[PDB]
Write a protein that binds this ligand. Structure first.
Ligand SMILES: Nc1nc2c(ncn2[C@@H]2O[C@H](COP(=O)(O)OP(=O)(O)O)[C@@H](O)[C@H]2O)c(=O)[nH]1
Ligand SMILES: Nc1nc2c(ncn2[C@@H]2O[C@H](COP(=O)(O)OP(=O)(O)O)[C@@H](O)[C@H]2O)c(=O)[nH]1
Lengths: 307, 118, 119, 307
């Protein structure tokens, strides 16, 4: 019955949240927080939070992170209200702009002050966006890590590897939206629609709470060796390339499959994970059964407390 | 031998649960390397209750369903898939044709169909 | 609260027996330092089956009765005496009156009355 | 299921068996074997076996054991027919006469040849019967002992003491009948009417088979400490006086009580007994519940493999 809220901050953050509200991310409440008043009009998210109407006058920020920060400081109270009652909050944004990089850390401070488990799921700018934005993003990320339990980072640069020849400007950000949705879905589902009884909210809190930086990888496969192929594919996902899985304090695994999931497939994923996880790590493997799913098997791995 | 069985419990709700626990606990430890699948059990059978009941946490799948009609259909599909040694249902009322469907699905999946009436 | 409960098992005879075992096994190990008394169980429940079912051989008492009427009186008596945490009957038919009788007897003995029906 | 047959040999043996048939002692087949055809007419046993029609011509053995033996040898065949199908045989007789002391050993031999568990429960003459019978009894007990798994030799002298002033010729022999019945019933009820499932026929055999000399004591009590009282009473029963429980290879204990038997009481009995038996002795404690018994708790202890 956990109350899970997802807040998209800024332009990119809003696009990801609206993409989540349209696809398959159930059991959560969606909120879009932005200084840009026009961007909050006619959107999927049921709740909107127009940040700093006095500092920005609804005109948005100008890619200036200070404006985003000041607008958030102005609405600490309204940020509290929109978050009231959550057992968990996902903060998603595209770091590198003004609203997202500036306001997210402040929104996180509030959530933390309220004792709410907080997981940030953000992207680092694409190399084509310039050094300036990458610098801004890095700073905002550093400020963010000071108040979130787990900070999942998605370097957009890696999305280009995944996309390959299918890359285009529209497809690149569309991919970012989808990856962010997979992160929120992978975790939220373990909490809201678990198929097994071995992982409860407390177990998730244990692998997420006060962990710091995190990263994820996803994979899916069909056929006779789908369990191993999906798991290995998640491990070698470029979004998890630069991470020493054995060096992570927490490991949350989401197995999503239809009723054709066999006991052996479940143990296969567990065995593969145990081989990469450190013995000093908290490992939780939650399972989600999609009653209408068949042949495919998805594996989502979130490595927390990296380093 | 694959087939349909029915277990009924009458009495205080708390008593019925206590009596049911040992069956589910043992079913979750079946030697057969397959799942123990529970289909839309009553609200009283929370994940917490099943854990506190001592069931093997790593060998049970719990699937929900909106209503009896859906639960019946999901039970037969689960039985039919053959991934569970036992598929436990909580269906009442249950028609003659319904029990027939369940027993046929059990045979197809070489599994056991067990309906529980509380 | 001490009271009357009833367990019914339907299906193939062998299936009904194997589903019964874990409950009897569990009951035979009850923390309450008293007997598990079985009254006039079906011929199927031989002393050998009970031992193979893994019941605690030191905490079970199996009593016989000539007929349902006798088993009913014997059941209430064993409950009444309060020497068993659980008295298991295999009565069918069982009237609302008989159930009340068993229930009253159970309360007096601070014990549980459990009737089992197979078929 | 186990087929248990009781054979009373001779006059006294016939009376003992007739007493058994008119009292408790359920689940056993009664047979009176005698050379005295007249004694086989007005009895309660349903089966009779006239020994040696050709030798004694149905007139008895005249107290000469040799005649009893010759009669039995004549009907070795009819004896096997009567014992056929038995899983256990109790042979009871008053040692000291002609038929009983002479035929009992032969009947035991036949039972032994057929592989039937054989338990003999016999008496030694009362001193008021004379030196001749006592001498004859001694020789006979030696012969019998060589062909039975267990031999309980009850000295009537002890019974005359237990009777005190109520002692009369008739009362004395009635007491013997009653004690003999207690031996048979105590052991057979464990086999035929066990209330618990911890002791099976195989267990009883372990205690009874090829054991040798044996003796038994009985006790009964009512009220709050009946468990201890009945058990102590059975141990201090004069029939077990000059018997060292710690020296017995086997110990068979029959607890008989009604539905008021408590789990604690059943435990006390075994506690008291394990206290007297050696750690190397085989101890079996059977429980018989008499549906319509109340307050009274009976304890019978049979020590086998004495010495
Ligand atoms: N997921 C996602 N990220 C985006 C999208 N457009 C831009 N971004 C990223 O998010 C960053 C922030 O830009 P923007 O959202 O315009 O900033 P803000 O509104 O001032 O916070 C950029 O540097 C991009 O990497 C989009 O449609 N979806
Ligand atoms: N239990 C019992 N023993 C008896 C009875 N009458 C005699 N005896 C004993 O059994 C012995 C054998 O005597 P009896 O049976 O007449 O001898 P048999 O028939 O020739 O073997 C005697 O020495 C007595 O001690 C009786 O009524 N009951």
């Amino acid at each position: 019955t956990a109350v899970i809220k997802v807040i998209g901050v800024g332009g990119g953050g809003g696009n990801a949240v609206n993409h989540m509200a349209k696809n398959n991310v159930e059991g959560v409440e969606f909120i879009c927080a932005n200084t840009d008043a026009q961007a909050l009009k006619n959107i999927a998210a049921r709740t909107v939070l127009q940040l700093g109407p006095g500092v920005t006058k609804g005109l948005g920020a100008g890619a200036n992170p200070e404006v985003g920060r000041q607008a958030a400081l102005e609405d600490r109270e309204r940020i509290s209200e929109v978050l009231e009652g959550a057992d968990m909050v996902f903060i998603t944004t595209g770091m590198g702009g003004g609203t997202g990089t500036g306001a997210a850390p402040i929104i996180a401070e509030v959530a933390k002050e309220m004792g709410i488990l907080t997981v940030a799921v953000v992207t680092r700018p694409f190399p084509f966006e310039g050094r300036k934005r990458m610098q801004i993003a890095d700073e905002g990320i550093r400020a963010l890590a000071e108040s979130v339990d787990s900070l999942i980072t998605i370097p957009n640069e890696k999305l280009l590897t995944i996309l390959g020849k299918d890359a285009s400007l529209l497809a690149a950000f569309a991919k970012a939206d989808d990856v962010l949705a997979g992160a929120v879905r992978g975790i939220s589902d373990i909490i809201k629609r678990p198929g097994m009884i071995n992982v409860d909210f407390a177990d998730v809190k244990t692998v997420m709470s006060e962990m710091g930086m995190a990263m994820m990888g996803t994979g899916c496969a069909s056929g006779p060796n789908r369990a191993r192929e999906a798991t290995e594919a998640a491990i070698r996902n470029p979004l998890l390339e630069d991470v020493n899985l054995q060096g992570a304090r927490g490991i949350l695994v989401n197995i999503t499959a239809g009723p054709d999931l066999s006991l052996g497939e479940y143990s296969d994923v567990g065995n593969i994970i145990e081989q990469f996880a450190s013995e000093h790590a908290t490992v939780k493997v939650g399972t989600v059964i999609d009653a209408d799913m068949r042949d495919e098997l998805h594996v989502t791995v979130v490595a927390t407390g990296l380093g | 031998p694959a087939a349909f069985s029915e277990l009924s419990l009458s009495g205080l709700p708390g008593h019925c649960l206590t009596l049911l626990a040992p069956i589910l606990r043992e079913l979750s430890e079946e030697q057969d390397a397959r799942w123990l699948t529970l289909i839309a059990p009553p609200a009283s059978l929370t994940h917490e209750w099943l854990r506190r009941a001592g069931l093997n946490r790593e060998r049970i799948l719990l699937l929900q369903a909106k209503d009896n009609a859906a639960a019946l259909a999901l039970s037969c599909e689960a039985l039919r898939l053959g991934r569970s040694h036992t598929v436990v249902s909580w269906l009442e009322p249950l028609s003659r044709a319904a029990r027939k469907q369940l027993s046929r699905a059990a045979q197809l999946g070489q599994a056991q169909s067990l309906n529980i009436r509380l």
